[PDB]
């Protein structure tokens, strides 16, 4: 009855992969796609009850991606390749939006997980986890919405695993710390698949007996809106929760004067 779902979100920002391609490094987007497909095939291999969900995170939208080889594996790989080529071939940069819709892809993944769980019969319990690979830079404006995702997963007790390739994201670190998922940056991009298999492939119960690298240290500093500097102790607004370094009689954000006689 153990139904393991491993939703994989792929950072499919064309700009970062173009930068990497111009660098002519050993690792490209094709290798990333191949590693993701192999990991998903292995996940489906480990048990019949296991399910695979692959969604590509792109700036324009979040795409639901899904001869001597397994029939279902071959069909799934064909579908994934078809969808990714259809998206990237028609991926026309129209606008200055560079940050990928990371939050939207996570929200769509959570909706898909909820729909699967509703479709899952009471006879079986569907353990769910999400693995996200980070390649491009992190986004700022999504932060709040990103937070809305995190607790939501913690609402349904879903692990969130982060695989940073190039650009670190403290948001991902905090999400992994909160939801209990694993955060780790790949030192050598060509070795990505083994990092996926050795660490992110086993389930948490399997991870329980397994010995794994300790989680990275996570900080929780704050930005003082008037200057957005690091702050240890700050003045918290009781109206709109805006934080200030110095005492103020009127809050800039809530526009409500602090009635301190």
């Amino acid at each position: 009855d153990e139904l393991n779902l491993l939703v994989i979100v792929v950072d499919a920002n064309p700009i970062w992969w173009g930068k990497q391609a111009l660098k002519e490094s050993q690792f490209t987007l094709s290798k990333c796609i191949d590693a993701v497909m192999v990991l998903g095939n292995s996940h489906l291999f480990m048990n019949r009850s296991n399910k695979l969900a692959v969604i590509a995170s792109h700036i324009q939208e979040s795409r639901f991606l899904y001869d001597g080889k397994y029939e279902l594996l071959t069909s799934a790989n064909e579908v994934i390749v078809e969808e990714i080529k259809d998206l990237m071939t028609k991926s026309d940069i129209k606008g200055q939006h560079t940050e990928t819709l990371l939050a939207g892809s996570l929200a769509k993944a959570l909706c898909y997980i909820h729909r699967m769980n509703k479709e899952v019969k009471d006879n079986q319990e569907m353990k769910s986890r999400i693995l996200v690979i980070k390649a491009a830079e992190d986004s700022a404006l999504q932060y709040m919405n990103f937070m809305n995702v995190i607790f939501a997963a913690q609402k349904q007790n879903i692990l969130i695993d982060a695989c940073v390739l190039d650009s670190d994201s403290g948001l991902l670190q905090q999400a992994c710390d909160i939801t209990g998922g694993l955060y780790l940056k790949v030192p050598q991009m060509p070795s990505l698949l083994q990092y996926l298999l050795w660490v992110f492939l086993p389930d948490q119960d399997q991870r329980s007996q397994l010995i794994l690298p300790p989680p990275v240290h996570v900080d929780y500093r704050a930005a003082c809106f008037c200057h957005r500097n690091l702050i240890e102790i700050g003045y918290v607004c009781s109206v709109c929760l805006s934080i200030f370094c110095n005492f103020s009689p009127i809050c800039t954000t809530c526009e409500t004067a602090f009635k301190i006689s």
Partner: protein
């Protein structure tokens, strides 16, 4: 596994709650929820004087009964600004509890003060460092078992008090030690999502 015996005493319970909340800061809301099973209460003194005192103390009182409506409970809920509800079943009980989970609307007389809070990090001391000096956590210290003697954790930025759990207000200096996700956890209250337009499928001439 308690012993259900006797009758409820609204006066004593409300007096104890008020005494506990008598010294609370003005900005923090003072809300009381009461579950009333029996329709009879024994009052060692007048009850309406306590109602006046609570109203002067700006302490909100909400009542969710089980049998039927009680005039005294209705007056208490109405005068103090709270809400009085009646349980129809377990589903309605859950609905009422969920409705009481959300923060109540703020009263006009409620103050808006600029409260000062600190945000310490999870300072973990490693024995590879010569400054890995463990100290029993204040929260764990007041415990029957052995308090958590961890090398590191959360240290108060104001008085260097050590706590192994968050979010916990500091016992010594009174500082409210929180974390950034905790503040952002309630932002959906600030920005509620409006209900979507329900349209029949036949009348929805768009995507399927």
């Amino acid at each position: 596994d308690m012993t259900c015996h006797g009758e409820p005493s609204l006066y004593n319970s409300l007096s104890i709650a008020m005494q506990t909340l008598k010294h609370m800061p003005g900005h923090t809301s003072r809300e009381v929820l009461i579950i009333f099973s029996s329709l009879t209460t024994c009052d060692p003194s007048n009850i309406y004087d306590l109602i006046k005192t609570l109203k002067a103390a700006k302490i909100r009182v909400s009542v969710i009964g089980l049998s039927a409506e009680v005039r005294v409970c209705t007056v208490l809920a109405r005068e103090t600004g709270g809400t009085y509800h009646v349980i129809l079943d377990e589903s309605h009980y859950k609905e009422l509890l969920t409705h009481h989970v959300s923060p109540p609307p703020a009263s006009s007389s409620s103050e808006c003060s600029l409260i000062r809070m600190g945000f310490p990090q999870h300072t973990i001391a490693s024995l590879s460092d010569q400054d890995a000096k463990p100290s029993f956590s204040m929260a764990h210290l007041d415990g029957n078992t052995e308090p958590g003697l961890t090398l590191g954790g959360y240290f108060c930025p104001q008085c260097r008090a050590k706590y192994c759990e968050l979010p916990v207000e500091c016992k010594i200096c009174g500082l409210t030690l929180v974390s950034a996700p905790h503040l952002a956890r309630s932002y959906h209250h600030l920005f509620p999502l409006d209900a979507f337009q329900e349209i029949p499928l036949e009348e929805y001439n768009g995507e399927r």
